[PDB]
Amino acid sequence: TKQLPEKGQTVRVARGQFAGIEAIYLEPDGDTRSIMLVKMISQQVPMSIENTDWEVT
């Protein structure tokens, strides 16, 4: 029985449009949605993704 990731948790996006990108878990916005901080080479930008798109280990 695994529990959803907590704020400050690292998650790797594998499925979805942002699949293949790293994101930091922040707050579980919705059971099918979630808010994570995405960093880029130009600037960092927080975005929301669904666990079905990213997984946590």
Side-chain angles (χ1 to χ4, degrees):
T1 164
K2 295 185 185 244
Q3 304 193 152
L4 288 133
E6 298 185 351
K7 177 188 195 104
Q9 187 72 62
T10 309
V11 60
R12 186 180 183 221
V13 196
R15 295 182 70 248
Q17 291 179 346
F18 262 104
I21 192 172
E22 191 177 357
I24 307 311
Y25 204 76
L26 269 51
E27 251 68 61
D29 186 8
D31 291 350
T32 57
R33 279 180 312 239
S34 77
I35 312 306
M36 331 170 110
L37 193 149
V38 185
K39 296 185 191 77
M40 301 186 175
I41 300 173
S42 68
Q43 301 175 343
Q44 301 176 344
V45 285
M47 293 184 290
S48 184
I49 319 179
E50 304 85 359
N51 70 75
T52 65
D53 289 347
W54 47 251
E55 302 178 348
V56 303
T57 325

